[PDB]
Design a protein around this ligand. Sequence first.
Ligand code: SF4
Ligand code: SF4
Ligand code: FES
Ligand code: FES
Lengths: 633, 633
Amino acid sequence: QNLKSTDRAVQQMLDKAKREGIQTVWDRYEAMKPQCGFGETGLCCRHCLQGPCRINPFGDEPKVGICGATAEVIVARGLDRSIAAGAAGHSGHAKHLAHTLKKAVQGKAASYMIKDRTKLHSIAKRLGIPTEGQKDEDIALEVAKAALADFHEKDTPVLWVTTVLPPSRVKVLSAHGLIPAGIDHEIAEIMHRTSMGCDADAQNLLLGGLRCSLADLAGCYMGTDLADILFGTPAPVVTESNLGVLKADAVNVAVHGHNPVLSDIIVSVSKEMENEARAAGATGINVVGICCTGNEVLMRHGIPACTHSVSQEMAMITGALDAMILDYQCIQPSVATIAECTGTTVITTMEMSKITGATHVNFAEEAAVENAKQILRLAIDTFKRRKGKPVEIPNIKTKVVAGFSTEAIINALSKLNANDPLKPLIDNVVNGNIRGVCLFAGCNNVKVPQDQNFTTIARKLLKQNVLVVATGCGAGALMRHGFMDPANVDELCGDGLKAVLTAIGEANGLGGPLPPVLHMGSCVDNSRAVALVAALANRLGVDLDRLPVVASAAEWMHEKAVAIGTWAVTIGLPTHIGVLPPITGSLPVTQILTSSVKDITGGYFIVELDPETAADKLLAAINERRAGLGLPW
Amino acid sequence: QNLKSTDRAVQQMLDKAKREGIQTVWDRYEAMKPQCGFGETGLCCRHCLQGPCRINPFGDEPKVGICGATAEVIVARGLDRSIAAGAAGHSGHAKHLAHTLKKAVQGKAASYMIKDRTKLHSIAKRLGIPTEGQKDEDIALEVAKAALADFHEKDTPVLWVTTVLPPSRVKVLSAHGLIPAGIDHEIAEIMHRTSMGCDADAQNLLLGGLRCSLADLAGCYMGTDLADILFGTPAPVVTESNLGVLKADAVNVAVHGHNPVLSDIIVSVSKEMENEARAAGATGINVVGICCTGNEVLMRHGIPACTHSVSQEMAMITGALDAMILDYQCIQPSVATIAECTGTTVITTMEMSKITGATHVNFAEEAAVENAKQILRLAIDTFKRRKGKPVEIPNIKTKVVAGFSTEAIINALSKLNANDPLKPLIDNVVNGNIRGVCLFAGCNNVKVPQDQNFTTIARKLLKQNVLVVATGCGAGALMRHGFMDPANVDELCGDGLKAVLTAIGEANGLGGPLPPVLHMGSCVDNSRAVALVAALANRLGVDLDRLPVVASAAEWMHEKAVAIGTWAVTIGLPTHIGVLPPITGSLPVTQILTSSVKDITGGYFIVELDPETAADKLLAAINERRAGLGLPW
Ligand code: SF4
Ligand code: SF4
Ligand code: FES
Ligand code: FES
């Protein structure tokens, strides 16, 4: 089971699932080998009914699609559609929050409100929305209307691109026509240009994809902005992660998916309903998090993370998981089947995200508290059905310090230098106590032993004094292996990194260092890391493609992560990817994405499947930037 | 060569290509067999990097995708993405025209203008735009702004859906939540819900697809509306089709693609440049049409159709084709390679539609006449390079009567009954001179001998007194085989259909009948057939799912046609498809699309690959509607 997952709680539940006969994601993967080489390399097209068309990676015919599409067109078209699909996910999430804020400040959804008035005012100021003399409700109404307006063409480009990056970066991107005109506009134009008998030039296609990845960036940043206004900007919190956060004696409720508009209410309402839970014989309601919506309520409220990504089924295998409350994105549809064996109530809540066999509760912001009570009563019913049964909850869990928004990080640094908070961080880069910054992002992937690339690369970078930040299931992996525990700084961090983490933590009254890895939130909260990097570039007066900053999608899976990986490159970052995207069937395309893009944006993809080699390549990339700034290394 | 194409001019050029060693679409198809059974049935998913996932149609594992996606989810998700891609094509075309009209009436593009003031006024009246007391420039500005506003969410639903269908049809669709909120909104929400770990319910997914097909409808209708305003509503025209419309002694220029904003200017400017052409030794400029943009300039100006769809390469094989001017959609990228052997100048003009190896001319409406002259000079240069060479133009061509817009058809009927023009058509339905109406739409497909299903089904329906109308390459197929020639009415049409076509034509001063098939325009002009059917339903006071009207995508290929086929079903039509979409790997989905959808919209798909059986099944469907109205049959 140790070739499946490096998580010990996960290995325990794999043994249970095996002997109970519950098929898992690793079983379904096994039943799928050997996988199709055509798809794996991207030499397959089904964009019309003359297809499917395949091209042999090597050898004789077929060498070309039926319409004449070459290998590089087919490969670039497929990649473009994954970027567009990822943008569509991050944009739908952000759109839903834009409507929720509009509804709230029009008096249409009283469960929702402007919780972070400071953030609302900086966002409105960043957008050129006038604040002085206006009600908060009116400023927020303007901000929501600007959010919705970035989805279509208008007099301006997408403001959640052009106002969040340094003007020098906006200029480099404009010169190549990469600035999105509208979020859903770019998504549609990609689907258009990649359909049969349209765009058939690899460079033209990939330039369209870079622009569409920036539409994804805009969706990510807008999602983070709106969630912070609605639900509070994260600040440092202490909690726990992994399966031992389940409690056999409580109604255990998992919030699972990506959009917190739902789960944040569940967190609030579940406290209300503790007495109703005690009456059925529970200690209370134990809300826990899965995937990125769990990270949302982890960053804001300190809700313990139960599990992530490829291993989500394992939470139900315990037999303790009474309800699993789903919005959308990255939910294995297998949970609906597996619940018939485990007793779990699987509840979908979102109109466009249903799973056959799951209970659906039609959630409306106008009725959020009504719906949350309805949902938590079903969980309480489910606990009663198992009241008495034996559960197997692995007694495994780690301590997690999280909540490192960009504002929290700046505030933390401001305790060493009140008037120039970025300077202490930069000073320690210059003198070498911080070699550079690495952002770990993205999913787990069944092809990679769970968390193996994340921890291996993280261990090597930290020993080399890299400041490591993390998001999404990359944060999930690092946290479940103790990387968000300050007590492991001594083991994990090099002396220079140790000193800076200790100096910052001691100055924030903790008598102890910051955690070895800074948890910056969910997948859309990759935009937080953009805000920090942009702030550092602006403070040093250079473009982002000169900073010693890199990214690692170490075990990535989802179309969202392809989009994220692609705008990481487009804003100027060397960007490591740990699972091959379907690109190797075309060397010209591979050459564009790993080398030639450097001359366009200054970022590039680093393809490397072996995590030790990946760490070396990421340190090289970081050290190359240091030398480019004239620093020692 | 007669198993490849039933077109004799096409068979001639296949012989030439064979002996000159030019590989063709049929050669590339041959080199691709046997095709992948997984893709062919829709049991293949590449929506994440854990994939590709395949499911065995029959037998043992794999039975399920790695994440747990079942066969019906995977199949429904793939179909949903093809509908979204088709909508994105039809919507991008319509969007480009909306901007062109905005630019024109703001004085920014003088080559463009309001050519059909009557149509502009009915459209504005249909939309609730006030006309009385307003300038045309201002009314048009309002119409363009409404067009652009149907792409995103607003206070109203998509008006190019809700104002073009009978209120009863809008009600049936609303009750199931099928009304699009915004065109690019639906495209994005489809890409969202079909991405990994989202919507996993076949019925929920397909309901999203029906709604997205209506976004495609809106794009089609908006494209037709704007093109008519900009370039004139078609009225009956006489011209010719097939390869013998090339002239060895002239500069032969093909307009190819779908968007006429470009080609309509070429038609105008090419007349200006005849003397420049004579100076190089040509008789003049011979502009001809390929695919749907050729149909556009065929409907409006009588430009001869040269060829269509699967056989477009064959135009270059003649050696006479000096330039091929491309916008986007359905252009085989092979033309860029084949031009190195034939001397043809292949010119792309659209920013998001480039082909490696082709000359690009950056077209701007602001500079249209400049660009057209630039492009036609390159054609004239190309004629000079071949001045003297032997060309092989098959001396094959048919007579084509076309230009049957819905307004032209109504005008034609108005000569038999001035105050109730639809009544003569309805009278002849009731008494049986017209059994019903069949709309042939969509592409050719290399899997089907070119035009074989179109002509076979057409022959059987016409003998049974079906009024047949046609669009896109279905019109292209029927016209190239003589079905737009009034001289074939006696051979082709049953006596009852013959009488009605003769009565209408004799009343329009032709001393002769209407053609055996009414050519209603390009693919977006399938919306014209909606307008006629809607007008007939409104005149009879029934919903569209009670009219003896059917559709045939007899040899369909493109994602656009999947979307078209799907909104044909969604507005209530029995809809025959002549090539299997990737749906047979899931019986539940197949059952929804061929039977169970009847209870939702009243339309349904008719899967039938044998054209004689298809004709029988379409007559059955038509006769079932007749009986439902109480008519004889
Ligand atoms: S678009 Fe081209 S390569 Fe793709 S399936 Fe159609 S014919 Fe084959
Ligand atoms: S979404 Fe599911 S079925 Fe599709 S590739 Fe990913 S794991 Fe396989
Ligand atoms: S042929 Fe296997 S992925 Fe297409
Ligand atoms: S395995 Fe062949 S189409 Fe996917």
